[PDB]
């Protein structure tokens, strides 16, 4: 397999997630021409990374709103929105 398919949990803490994300449809590409959402940054104080958020998983969904063929704009709006615990489900590749 090419990479694994994750589903982490993560509780918004001290007013954040503790990440950046890049991508999206139209948007500067994290890799390639994949114009997926990507994890780019994770605060090393923050809340994703203690749940094991790595920086280069793609974000597939977030509190059962799909990302795929999402615009970034619309990305950042489904972390905001997602309340306290916020069920991510990220594609690792090796």
Known sequence: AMGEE??????????????????GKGSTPYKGDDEGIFI???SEEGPAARAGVRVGDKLLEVNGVALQGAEHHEAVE?????????????????
Do not use: D
Not at 7 to 20: H, Y
Not at 80 to 94: K, S
């Open 6 to 23: 994750l589903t982490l949990t993560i509780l918004r803490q001290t007013g954040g997630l503790g990440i950046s994300i890049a991508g």
């Open 40 to 42: 780019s940054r994770v």
């Open 78 to 94: 489904a972390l905001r929105g997602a309340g306290t615990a916020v069920q991510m489900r990220v594609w690792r590749e090796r």
